[PDB]
Amino acid sequence: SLIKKKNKDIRIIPLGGVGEIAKNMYIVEVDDEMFMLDAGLMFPEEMLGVDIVIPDIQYVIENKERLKGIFLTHGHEHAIGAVSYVLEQIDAPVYGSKLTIALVKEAMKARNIKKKVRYYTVNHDSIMRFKNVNVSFFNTTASIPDSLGVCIHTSYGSIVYTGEFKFDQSLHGHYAPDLKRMAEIGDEGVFALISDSTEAEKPGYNTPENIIEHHMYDAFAKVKGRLIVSCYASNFVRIQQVLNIASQLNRKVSFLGRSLESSFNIARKMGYFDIPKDLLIPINEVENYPKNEVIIIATGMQGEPVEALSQMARKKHKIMNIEEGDSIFLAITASANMEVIIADTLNELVRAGAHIIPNNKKIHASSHGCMEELKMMLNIMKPEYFVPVQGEFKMQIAHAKLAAETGVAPEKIFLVEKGDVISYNGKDMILNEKVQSGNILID
């Protein structure tokens, strides 16, 4: 009764999501308990013959008896696309919001994996208790609803992992952030913040979605023929905007691609979308309408939209191809991994006689916090140590500069590569070890 248990050693190890924006996976150890935070995929970067890339988890396998859980922040492919592959190697519980869990189950069914999985749905009131720590959660604002940040409580203070977030006052309901809970976490004491760097190079605030939606309306109103929208199947913000605008322009909407069809059906049943009746049509009926009465939302059979758009542009798609006069709206976050395929696909679309709605100040990728939003998270959390993740190295550097601006000690900011081990022993935080890391190519 007189002795309280107290934590001694911490390790933080990125296995994916640094040096890239995708395949996020962060291992946190507190003494003899290990936690996996996200388990994403990345679509192939000239990688020929690859469908997806997932993190090498050999370090976790070597230590698997200590893995107490996989905690999933949100249902983007870059956060959950590797989960089924992880579960074929190791049997640990999977914690996530009601939507994230439903999406993981759909992935397991799609790969016909029959193994018993221990899912545990959490929300912002859940506190998961382990031997060494407790884990709590808080709502964030992502491009998919029901996203959660993760807070691992230790005797040194909390280890906070944000996942994807932005601060946008126009997003409410299942996108509303837990600002008061975040402030309480910061006030109680944050030992380490692990935060999203994807848009850390961009000044200001990301554009609010109400303004993006109005600009999408203006652009789509000018489209004289068919409109093809290319986005991730997880981009529920964009999908909802397209549905709203379609109804206002007297266009029908149809989906092209397996992951979109499944994610939408799941989410619609769960009540996540506002859908006018008679808006949606099956893809086989699109040819029956005048061109200026249709919007097609297209993603890869796997959820990678640019490859499907390239197939359509080159008249190689199995179901539906681009025709001269089509207009295209491509909604995707830029990365080093995607820039060649994006450039080539845009060229192919122009050669096919399609019109490209610009990627400019009026409309552009608007998820992930820009500099001021990242500073806001830093100022709320007031971390002792800071580990920028979810980005290429230049994005991590930009984010580290923001942390120093908000007052994090520069010697307490760690710039990590895949397989690096940050460790703390109650005295010093060090980066003095590496573990195995790398890319597993799935065909």
Side-chain angles (χ1 to χ4, degrees), residues 315-317 319-360 363-364:
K315 305 181 174 58
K316 290 291 297 170
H317 195 279
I319 307 300
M320 177 176 146
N321 292 122
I322 300 312
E323 302 180 357
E324 189 181 319
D326 284 344
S327 299
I328 316 297
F329 176 63
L330 172 61
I332 184 161
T333 294
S335 64
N337 184 59
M338 291 291 101
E339 66 190 0
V340 175
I341 192 174
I342 288 170
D344 287 349
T345 301
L346 294 173
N347 290 336
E348 291 159 7
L349 286 162
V350 169
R351 288 208 300 295
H355 302 301
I356 301 167
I357 295 177
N359 169 27
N360 65 9
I363 319 173
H364 47 266

Side-chain angles (χ1 to χ4, degrees), residues 173-179 181-201 203-225:
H174 289 78
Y175 292 101
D178 280 339
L179 301 174
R181 291 162 193 248
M182 289 173 45
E184 290 170 348
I185 288 166
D187 286 345
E188 289 180 14
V190 175
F191 169 69
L193 176 64
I194 307 169
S195 185
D196 177 13
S197 306
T198 299
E199 292 296 349
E201 298 167 285
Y205 294 78
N206 224 335
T207 311
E209 294 306 332
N210 58 315
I211 295 179
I212 291 288
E213 185 175 351
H214 289 166
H215 296 170
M216 288 169 64
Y217 174 94
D218 295 339
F220 289 11
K222 296 183 196 162
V223 173
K224 297 178 311 287

Side-chain angles (χ1 to χ4, degrees), residues 7 30 33 35 71 126-137 150-155 157-159:
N7 306 126
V30 182
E33 288 188 311
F35 302 90
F71 300 74
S126 301
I127 297 170
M128 293 297 104
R129 296 181 199 282
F130 297 95
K131 186 167 61 61
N132 299 339
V133 299
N134 294 328
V135 182
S136 64
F137 304 89
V150 179
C151 184
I152 301 168
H153 299 267
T154 87
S155 61
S158 59
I159 299 166

Side-chain angles (χ1 to χ4, degrees), residues 113 117-124:
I113 301 190
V117 177
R118 292 181 285 155
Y119 300 106
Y120 293 122
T121 294
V122 295
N123 60 35
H124 66 175

Side-chain angles (χ1 to χ4, degrees), residues 165-179 181-201 203-257 260-264 266-268 270-276 279-300 303-317 319-360 363-380:
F165 70 94
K166 78 182 289 200
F167 289 110
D168 178 340
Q169 295 179 232
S170 80
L171 286 177
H172 327 281
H174 289 78
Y175 292 101
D178 280 339
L179 301 174
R181 291 162 193 248
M182 289 173 45
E184 290 170 348
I185 288 166
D187 286 345
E188 289 180 14
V190 175
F191 169 69
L193 176 64
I194 307 169
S195 185
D196 177 13
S197 306
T198 299
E199 292 296 349
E201 298 167 285
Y205 294 78
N206 224 335
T207 311
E209 294 306 332
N210 58 315
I211 295 179
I212 291 288
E213 185 175 351
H214 289 166
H215 296 170
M216 288 169 64
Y217 174 94
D218 295 339
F220 289 11
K222 296 183 196 162
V223 173
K224 297 178 311 287
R226 302 196 302 178
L227 174 59
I228 295 83
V229 171
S230 178
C231 59
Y232 281 61
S234 61
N235 197 336
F236 288 15
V237 165
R238 283 285 178 283
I239 293 162
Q240 183 70 68
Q241 291 163 332
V242 171
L243 297 173
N244 290 350
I245 294 164
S247 179
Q248 293 165 43
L249 295 176
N250 282 329
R251 292 181 178 258
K252 306 297 190 177
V253 177
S254 193
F255 305 142
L256 186 69
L260 171 55
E261 283 192 84
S262 68
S263 303
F264 189 83
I266 284 176
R268 170 193 205 167
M270 293 175 76
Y272 285 100
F273 281 97
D274 289 325
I275 314 162
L279 181 64
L280 299 179
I281 62 174
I283 193 71
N284 276 344
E285 287 277 349
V286 164
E287 74 171 3
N288 297 325
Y289 287 79
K291 294 185 164 207
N292 67 7
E293 287 184 27
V294 303
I295 304 181
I296 300 87
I297 305 176
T299 159
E304 203 294 283
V306 188
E307 192 277 336
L309 183 62
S310 175
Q311 290 178 0
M312 297 174 81
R314 290 178 298 117
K315 305 181 174 58
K316 290 291 297 170
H317 195 279
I319 307 300
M320 177 176 146
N321 292 122
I322 300 312
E323 302 180 357
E324 189 181 319
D326 284 344
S327 299
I328 316 297
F329 176 63
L330 172 61
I332 184 161
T333 294
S335 64
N337 184 59
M338 291 291 101
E339 66 190 0
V340 175
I341 192 174
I342 288 170
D344 287 349
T345 301
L346 294 173
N347 290 336
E348 291 159 7
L349 286 162
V350 169
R351 288 208 300 295
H355 302 301
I356 301 167
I357 295 177
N359 169 27
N360 65 9
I363 319 173
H364 47 266
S366 54
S367 62
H368 309 272
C370 294
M371 287 181 187
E372 295 300 319
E373 290 160 286
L374 301 184
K375 287 188 305 180
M376 279 175 59
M377 178 69 75
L378 279 152
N379 284 149
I380 291 168

